[PDB]
Each structure stands twice: as structure tokens, then as C-alpha cells.
Amino acid sequence: GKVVSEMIAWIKSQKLIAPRMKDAPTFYRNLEEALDVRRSTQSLMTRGQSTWKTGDAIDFCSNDLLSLGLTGELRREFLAELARHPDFSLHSGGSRVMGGNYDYIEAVEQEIADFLGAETALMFNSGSNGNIAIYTAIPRPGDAIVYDELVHFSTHTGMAASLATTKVAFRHNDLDAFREAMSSTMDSHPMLQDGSRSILVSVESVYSMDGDVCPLVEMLEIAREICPKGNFAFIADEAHATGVVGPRGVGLVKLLGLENEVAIRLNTCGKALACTGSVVLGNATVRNMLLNYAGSLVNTTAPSFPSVAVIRAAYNLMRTGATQKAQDNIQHLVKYFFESITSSNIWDKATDLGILSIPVAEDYESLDFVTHIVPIWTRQKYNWWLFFHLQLAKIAVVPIDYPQVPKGKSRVRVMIHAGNTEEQVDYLVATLCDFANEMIDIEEGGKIPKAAQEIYALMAAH
Amino acid sequence: VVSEMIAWIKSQKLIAPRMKDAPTFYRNLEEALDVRRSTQSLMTRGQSTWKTGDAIDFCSNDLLSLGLTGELRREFLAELARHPDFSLHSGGSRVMGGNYDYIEAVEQEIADFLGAETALMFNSGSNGNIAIYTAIPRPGDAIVYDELVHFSTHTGMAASLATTKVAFRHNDLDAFREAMSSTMDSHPMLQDGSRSILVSVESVYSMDGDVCPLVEMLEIAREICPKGNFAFIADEAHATGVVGPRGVGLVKLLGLENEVAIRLNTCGKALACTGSVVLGNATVRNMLLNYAGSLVNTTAPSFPSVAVIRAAYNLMRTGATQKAQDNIQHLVKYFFESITSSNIWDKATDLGILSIPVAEDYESLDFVTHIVPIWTRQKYNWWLFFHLQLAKIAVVPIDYPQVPKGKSRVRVMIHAGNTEEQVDYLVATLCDFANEMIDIEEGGEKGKIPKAAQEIYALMAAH
Numbered sequence: 021g022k023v024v025s026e027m028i029a030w031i032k033s034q035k036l037i038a039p040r041m042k043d044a045p046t047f048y049r050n051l052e053e054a055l056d057v058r059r060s061t062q063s064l065m066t067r068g069q070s071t072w073k074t075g076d077a078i079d080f081c082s083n084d085l086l087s088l089g090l091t092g093e094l095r096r097e098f099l100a101e102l103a104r105h106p107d108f109s110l111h112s113g114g115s116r117v118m119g120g121n122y123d124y125i126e127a128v129e130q131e132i133a134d135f136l137g138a139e140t141a142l143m144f145n146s147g148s149n150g151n152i153a154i155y156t157a158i159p160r161p162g163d164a165i166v167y168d169e170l171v172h173f174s175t176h177t178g179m180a181a182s183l184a185t186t187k188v189a190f191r192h193n194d195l196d197a198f199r200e201a202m203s204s205t206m207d208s209h210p211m212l213q214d215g216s217r218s219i220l221v222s223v224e225s226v227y228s229m230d231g232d233v234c235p236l237v238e239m240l241e242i243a244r245e246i247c248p249k250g251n252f253a254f255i256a257d258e259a260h261a262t263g264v265v266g267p268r269g270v271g272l273v274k275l276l277g278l279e280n281e282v283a284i285r286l287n288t289c290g291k292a293l294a295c296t297g298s299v300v301l302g303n304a305t306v307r308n309m310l311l312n313y314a315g316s317l318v319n320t321t322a323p324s325f326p327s328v329a330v331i332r333a334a335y336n337l338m339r340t341g342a343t344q345k346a347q348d349n350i351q352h353l354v355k356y357f358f359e360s361i362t363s364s365n366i367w368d369k370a371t372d373l374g375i376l377s378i379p380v381a382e383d384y385e386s387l388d389f390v391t392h393i394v395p396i397w398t399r400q401k402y403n404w405w406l407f408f409h410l411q412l413a414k415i416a417v418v419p420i421d422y423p424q425v426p427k428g429k430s431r432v433r434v435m436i437h438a439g440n441t442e443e444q445v446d447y448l449v450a451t452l453c454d455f456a457n458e459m460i461d462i463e464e465g466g467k468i469p470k471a472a473q474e475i476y477a478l479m480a481a482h
Numbered sequence: 483v484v485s486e487m488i489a490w491i492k493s494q495k496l497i498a499p500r501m502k503d504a505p506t507f508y509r510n511l512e513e514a515l516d517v518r519r520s521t522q523s524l525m526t527r528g529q530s531t532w533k534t535g536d537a538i539d540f541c542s543n544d545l546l547s548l549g550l551t552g553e554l555r556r557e558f559l560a561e562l563a564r565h566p567d568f569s570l571h572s573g574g575s576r577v578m579g580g581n582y583d584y585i586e587a588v589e590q591e592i593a594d595f596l597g598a599e600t601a602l603m604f605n606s607g608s609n610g611n612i613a614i615y616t617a618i619p620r621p622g623d624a625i626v627y628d629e630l631v632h633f634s635t636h637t638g639m640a641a642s643l644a645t646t647k648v649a650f651r652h653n654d655l656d657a658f659r660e661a662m663s664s665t666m667d668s669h670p671m672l673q674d675g676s677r678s679i680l681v682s683v684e685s686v687y688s689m690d691g692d693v694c695p696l697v698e699m700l701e702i703a704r705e706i707c708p709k710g711n712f713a714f715i716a717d718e719a720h721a722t723g724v725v726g727p728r729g730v731g732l733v734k735l736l737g738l739e740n741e742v743a744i745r746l747n748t749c750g751k752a753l754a755c756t757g758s759v760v761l762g763n764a765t766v767r768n769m770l771l772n773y774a775g776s777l778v779n780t781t782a783p784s785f786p787s788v789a790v791i792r793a794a795y796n797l798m799r800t801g802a803t804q805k806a807q808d809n810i811q812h813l814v815k816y817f818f819e820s821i822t823s824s825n826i827w828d829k830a831t832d833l834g835i836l837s838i839p840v841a842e843d844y845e846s847l848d849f850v851t852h853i854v855p856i857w858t859r860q861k862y863n864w865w866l867f868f869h870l871q872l873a874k875i876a877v878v879p880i881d882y883p884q885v886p887k888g889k890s891r892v893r894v895m896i897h898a899g900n901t902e903e904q905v906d907y908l909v910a911t912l913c914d915f916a917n918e919m920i921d922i923e924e925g926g927e928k929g930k931i932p933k934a935a936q937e938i939y940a941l942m943a944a945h
């Protein structure tokens with residue numbers, strides 16, 4: 021219905037366009053050639069998913085983690101906040117350091133900083149710009165940046181534009197490789213050995229595309245062991261941690277009581293807090309470093325009053341406890357899904373054959389908590405088929421593929437929200453087990469499964 | 483207020499001395515901050531002295547006084563009220579489930595008001611320029627850009643896939659002609675029309691206040707690129723709302739919406755909120771959605787953020803900013819006649835004591851802009867700022883790194899909500915400073931400090 025109208029528009033947008041641009045001007049000629057590169061691998065993005073916004077599909081893909089957007093709970097606290105300041109000055113006035121600072125944004129920052137256990141906060145338009153500012157301002161020449169290989173794109177963009185000359189990745193969440201990265205970096209840099217420069221460790225609290233948790237206590241112990249002079253500093257991107265983890269959604273850093281051990285923390289408002297923006301946490305020296313050396317911040321207009329107001333409304337819902345029930349239902353529904361798919365008859369054969377792989381679902385009971393992020397892996401030549409199977413079953417997931425991940429690591433990303441139900445989770449489990457069945461029967465018989473046939477049929481027409 | 487200047491005075495006291503047993507990371511961080519303090523140009527809280535009412539606003543970016551009057555606020559809240567059940571959260575990135583009908587419809591309203599085929603909305607003008615210059619240039623293309631394009635344009639070009647980036651002297655048609663032709667003559671794939679030259683300009687330049695001669699550069703581009711293998715990119719941050727009928731900006735005013743492939747219009751200035759739109763055909767828009775990785779990997783704008791942009795443009799389309807816009811023109815022409823009619827103007831400008839280049843031949847233009855950069859001698863620049871501030875006139879001082887080392891100045895912004903009496907006081911204050919400086923220099927005492935600097939140097943001693 022509405023599922024099939026967007027599949028058609030998606031199929032149609034991958035038709036190569038350059039063979040029609042021979043007469044077009046050179047500028048548009050080469051742009052449509054560049055778009056054709058993506059079309060050729062069927063990865064041209066246009067209008068997104070959105071079948072869940074209309075009711076035509078379950079929402080297992082959006083970032084509305086606590087359903088604050090779905091319920092209108094944030095909108096009502098947002099309008100209530102604007103009503104506490106009639107005649108508010110909407111316009112900031114300019115750059116935050118030249119005409120754009122005002123009392124209400126400083127007060128909201130300190131309010132948030134107090135709630136998350138930090139000394140100071142600085143507000144950005146987004147988590148991305150938060151990362152851009154951190155890694156263009158904070159790293160000094162002679163510093164070293166050691167980062168998890170799956171840090172966010174904005175972190176990669178910030179580090180590339182950094183003043184630091186030494187940046188070394190380490191294998192994802194691997195405490196051994198992080199040790200090897202730390203000590204091999206120390207040994208070859210005499211300025212780190214005598215403590216005249218620092219090593220900056222860059223990690224995410226919860227990884228957007230894997231769903232696992234940074235072992236921060238252990239990394240901090242490794243760091244102190246390698247750098248006994250204390251010349252290290254951590255930077256924790258809690259994008260997918262805020263609102264999900266910790267008492268009243270404070271995140272992983274405060275949950276572990278590391279608020280004095282992690283020098284820089286980024287908390288974003290784009291997921292659980294159901295709006296946009298971010299704050300960078302640190303002491304007053306970090307904050308003044310961003311205001312003075314993060315040129316991206318210096319040359320952009322400061323947040324408007326409504327933008328600050330929606331952020332404050334979201335932390336209000338967190339800090340007054342209004343999100344606590346939604347926060348536990350995530351834990352419940354993720355465990356409920358984990359129990360249900362690992363208890364179905366076919367999970368064992370499908371896991372050996374490699375038909376389905378959900379690594380976050382294994383050993384889940386030994387963790388202090390679970391995450392909302394559940395990537396589901398299949399065979400790489402089955403990935404689009406798994407997507408079409410769920411999509412045609414009226415379950416909206418996010419497909420992950422090149423360029424978003426390396427060209428061989430394709431997967432499906434399922435998001436469990438506080439506003440989902442056990443009936444919907446049962447439907448997701450049953451839907452996945454039908455797919456695992458279909459591919460095992462094909463593997464035991466060149467057949468193409470039902471769902472893919474229908475999508476390939478629509479292509480043969482469009 | 484004395485308090486804002488006192489706080490600024492304290493923020494310049496060096497701190498590296500107290501940092502010994504301070505850990506390496508905070509010591510090196512505060513050592514970098516000291517580099518700014520030792521030149522007295524550390525920034526902390528800005529210039530908000532005007533915001534309360536204790537100083538005249540000649541500094542903010544609220545050009546049409548939409549923020550001051552609450553006009554945009556009232557329309558913004560009525561727009562929210564006409565959508566009582568709006569979905570606040572976008573859902574994710576614009577290409578992954580953050581798209582919705584409201585933002586697309588708003589985009590097309592802005593495109594059609596601006597005379598463009600499509601529009602694409604960003605969090606900021608800076609993010610728009612980032613997206614343009616990382617997504618649009620192809621390998622083999624050349625970028626010819628005005629040296630004074632915005633910081634975000636410089637960041638975007640440095641992350642670009644184009645391998646020839648050529649700057650040219652600001653607003654200079656001969657320098658631009660020389661950049662275009664020497665770039666054309668050294669690239670066989672520009673000569674044969676298979677790659678393109680991208681031309682990057684601001685319609686109104688944020689710190690010199692002058693206007694890009696866009697019709698002249700298009701003529702020169704077509705001359706040097708007879709195959710038409712070129713494309714212009716016009717950043718209109720300081721034109722939207724303030725230039726053209728009903729604020730449509732410079733490109734539409736000259737009727738060049740079909741000759742300028744990419745346009746950036748921003749909401750941080752005269753439109754009194756935040757955000758931007760990139761304008762172009764659907765090939766440009768798809769290019770940004772697929773190759774601007776900054777856009778792909780960030781959350782899509784929430785409903786209230788879209789609605790205030792809509793309210794701003796709706797104000798412009800109902801003609802509710804035209805009188806504010808005519809007021810700007812009146813007040814800037816009034817400042818220009820006033821200051822150049824002053825007694826000391828001839829002497830102060832011959833001596834380089836005062837210099838306002840946008841005040842020269844302002845009558846030979848079709849319009850003026852709101853940006854009045856005021857120069858003095860480089861060693862007097864903070865003295866000029868102190869003098870203006872203590873006279874309760876809020877201006878924004880402009881020093882390294884915002885500008886080159888020896889190009890420090892002070893930026894006055896004329897807003898619609900300003901008055902002729904406020905302009906009279908500014909001129910009187912400027913003439914006092916010029917007179918005080920001419921006296922000090924002819925008195926032959928190289929240690930003589932002006933009055934307003936004496937007070938600042940006093941508080942520095944006390945505090």
C-alpha cells in the first residue's frame with residue numbers, strides 16, 4: 021500500500037540518469053554521473069523510510085527512543101516552557117562569543133551540567149558540531165588521539181581537521197588492541213613519555229551501529245597503567261546513552277561514577293531527548309578552549325530561545341523522573357525480545373548456518389543493562405532480502421550498507437523504543453523466524469525467497 | 483556596563499603560572515588560552531551590554547528588529563498553534579527516517595519565494611556551506627573563490643575533492659579575471675569543457691559590508707568559459723531580508739536565479755532565528771543528500787525549528803518586513819551623510835585616524851548594506867572599542883583570528899529598530915575619539931593614553 025509506493029519510488033530513483041545528460045551542461049552532467057555511482061550499487065538515498073510515521077508499519081527503526089515525540093510528552097513540556105517566559109527574546113543576536121550570549125542559555129547549560137555531574141556545559145546545534153568543536157579545538161600539537169575505530173563520522177571529520185599529528189585507531193571495543201595502541205603510541209613519542217603532551221582517548225558510550233557498551237572502567241585502568249604521569253584525557257560520546265542508561269537517564273559516565281575521570285563528555289538531544297542539539301561537558305578550561313579555538317562554533321549563530329527551551333524541557337522530563345517508566349520498558353522489551361528469539365525452535369540452526377546473527381542478544385543476561393540497538397546480521401548476499409522481507413511484513417527497520425559501513429559489513433538495524441509493545445515484539449520474532457526458515461529450505465534444496473521475488477517483480481515493471 | 487568590561491578584564495589575567503602540578507592536559511590547554519590573553523583577545527561571554535538596555539545596539543545581527551519587537555515570536559507561536567498536534571521529533575537523519583511532509587512543504591515555499599526550483603534545509607548557514615563544498619565539487623573541478631568567503635566555506639573547500647582551489651583579491655574583477663583565465667589555461671579538462679570551474683562568492687560580505695558585482699563576474703566567466711563549464715555559488719547570509727524587494731536577496735534582485743546554480747540563504751541574521759536553505763535544481767539537492775556526509779550523519783530538524791523559519795519567510799511574503807527594510811536604508815544613508823559631513827572627517831581620514839570605506843561613494847549605489855566596518859590605526863583599535871563601549875554604544879570588535887593579523891577593526895551594524903538620535907550620538911562619539919587621537923599625536927608625547935583607555939587601564943590595576 022504505502023509500503024509499496026515508497027519501494028517503487030526507491031526502485032525508480034536507482035535508474036541511471038547520465039545516459040540522458042549528454043546535452044546537459046557539464047556541471048549537471050558530472051553531478052548526475054556522481055549520483056549514478058551510488059545508483060549502480062542501489063544505494064541512492066532520497067526521501068527516507070517514513071512508513072512508520074503514517075501507521076502503515078511498526079516503528080523498529082526511528083531514534084525516538086523514549087517515545088517522547090510519539091506521545092507528545094515533550095511537546096507539552098516544550099509549550100509549557102515557552103509559557104513560563106512570555107515575551108522571550110527569540111533571536112540570540114549572533115555568534116556565542118560576539119553578541120549571541122544570553123542569560124537563559126547559560127542557565128540551562130549549568131542546569132544540565134548540574135544534573136549530569138559535570139562542572140560546566142556548552143550548547144551546540146547538534147552532536148556532530150559538538151564533535152567537530154572538540155577535535156578541532158582541544159587536541160594540541162604533539163598530542164595523540166587514540167580512538168575506537170567505530171567512532172562517529174563527525175569525530176572522524178574533527179580528528180582529520182585536528183592540530184594533532186598522531187591519530188591511531190584501535191579494533192572495536194578491544195581492550196587488548198586499545199592497550200597495544202596506547203603503549204606503542206607512548207613508546208614512539210618522547211613528548212608523551214616525559215609528560216609534555218597528552219593522549220586523548222575517544223570512545224562512544226553506546227555504539228550506534230553495534231549496540232555494545234564501552235568498558236570505560238577497564239579502559240581507564242589501562243590508561244593510568246600506560247601513562248603513569250596522568251597525561252591522558254578521555255572523550256565520551258554518549259549520543260545513544262543519554263536517556264537510556266543510568267538513574268533518570270544520566271548516561272553511562274555518571275552511572276559508573278566516572279564524572280571526575282572523563283575529561284570531556286558529549287550528550288546529544290537527537291535520540292532519547294526527541295529533539296536536536298547537544299552539550300559538551302567539562303571544566304571551565306575545556307569550555308573556554310571551545311569558545312576560542314573551535315572556529316566552527318566561533319563563526320555560527322548562537323542557539324535561539326526556542327531551541328534552548330526544548331532541550332531544557334527534555335532534561336526536565338528526565339530530571340523530574342517523567343522518563344523513568346519509559347526507560348525501564350526499553351529494558352523490558354529488549355530483554356523480552358532477546359528471550360523470545362533465542363527461545364524459538366530455529367534460532368540454533370539459524371545461528372550455526374549463519375542465517376541470522378544477533379551478537380547483542382548473546383550473553384545479555386550477564387550485563388547490568390541492555391541497549392535499544394539490535395543489529396540483525398544475515399548472509400551478505402541475503403541482506404537486501406532480509407530488509408525486503410521485514411519491510412513487506414510491515415516492519416520498518418533501517419538498512420545499513422555502503423557507504424554507511426564498509427562494503428562487506430551490511431546488516432539490518434532494529435531499534436527498540438519505550439512505546440513499542442510485546443505484541444509487536446512477538447510479530448518481529450515470528451517475522452524473523454519465517455525468514456530463517458525460508459533461507460534454510462532454500463539452502464537445503466538457485467531459489468529467491470518470496471519477499472525478494474515481489475521486490476524484483478516491481479523492478480521488472482519499474 | 484562596567485561589569486561586562488571588568489569580567490573581560492579579569493579573563494585576560496594569565497593562568498599558566500598557577501598550572502604546575504596541574505595535569506599535563508589542562509596545563510597545555512590553559513597554555514593555549516594564555517596565547518590569547520597575552521594579546522588581550524580572549525573571548526568569554528561576548529558583547530551583551532545592549533541586550534538589557536544599558537547600551538545602544540549597533541552590534542547585533544538582528545537586522546530587521548524582528549527579535550527586538552517580538553514580531554517573529556508572535557508569528558512563530560501562531561504557526562505552532564495552527565498545528566496543535568505537531569510531531570516534534572524528526573525521527574532521525576533526513577535520509578534515514580527524519581523526513582516529513584511539513585519540512586518538504588516549507589522547503590518548497592522558500593524555494594518558490596526565492597525563485598529556485600528546490601530548497602534543502604540545514605541547522606545553520608555554516609552547515610550549508612560545509613555540505614556544498616564537500617558534496618558538490620567533483621575530482622578534476624577547480625574552485626575560484628573570493629578570499630573573504632566565510633570560514634565554513636574555507637573548511638568545506640579544504641575537505642573537498644577538488645584539487646585546484648584558487649583565491650582572488652576581494653571584490654576585484656581584474657583579479658578574478660586573472661584567476662579564471664590562468665586556471666583555464668593550465669587545465670586541459672577545463673579547456674575542453676569536461677570539468678567545471680566553481681565560483682564561490684558572498685553577495686554581501688560580513689566584515690567589509692560590500693556587495694559582490696555578480697552581473698560583472700557572470701559576464702567574465704562566460705567570456706573565459708565559452709563552453710559554459712562553470713557554476714556560481716552565492717552565499718547570501720547578509721542579503722536575505724535586507725536586499726531586494728520583500729527581502730528576496732541579491733540574486734533574485736538582479737534576476738539571476740537561473741544563472742547562479744547554488745544559493746545559500748541563512749536565517750541567523752535579518753530572519754532572526756537559526757538555520758539555512760541551499761537552493762538549486764533537484765540534481766544539486768540529491769547531490770547534497772548523498773555526498774554531504776555531514777548532513778547524512780546528523781539528526782533532521784525538529785518541527786519547531788522548521789516552523790520559525792516558515793514564520794520568518796511568511797513575514798517577508800506578507801510585506802511585514804518592507805518598512806523595517808526601508809528603515810535600514812534610511813538609517814545607513816543618514817549615518818553616511820552625517821559622518822562625512824562632520825568637521826574633522828577630512829582630517830581624520832587623511833591621517834588614517836578614521837576610515838570607513840563603505841561611506842565612500844555610497845550615493846553611486848542602488849542600495850547600501852547594514853554592515854559599517856570602522857577602521858582606525860591598528861594600535862588604537864581596542865582604544866576605539868573601549869571609547870565606544872564606555873559611551874554606551876555596543877559594537878563588536880574584530881581581531882585575529884576572525885581577520886588577518888594587521889586588519890583589526892570594529893563592526894557597527896545598523897538595525898531597523900535604531901533611531902536617528904542614536905546615529906547622531908554615534909557620530910558625535912566617533913568625532914570625539916578622532917579629535918582626541920589627533921591631539922595626542924600632535925602633542926608629541928608617545929605615552930599619552932586617551933581618556934576611555936585610562937579608565938580601562940585603571941580597572942585593570944584595581945582588579
Ligand SMILES: CC/C(=N/Cc1c(COP(=O)(O)O)cnc(C)c1O)C(=O)O
Nearest residue numbers: 115319320321606607608632688719750
Ligand atoms: C556567526 C555570526 C556571523 N555569521 C556569518 C555568516 C555565516 C554563518 O551562518 P550561520 O550562523 O552558521 O547560520 C555564513 N555565511 C556568511 C556570509 C556569514 O557572514 C556574523 O557575521 O556575525
Ligand SMILES: CC/C(=N\Cc1c(COP(=O)(O)O)cnc(C)c1O)C(=O)O
Nearest residue numbers: 146147148172228259288290575780781
Ligand atoms: C542521526 C544519525 C545517528 N546518530 C548520530 C550520532 C551523532 C550525531 O548526533 P546529531 O544528530 O548531530 O545530534 C553523534 N554521535 C553518535 C555516536 C551518533 O550515533 C544514528 O545512529 O541514526
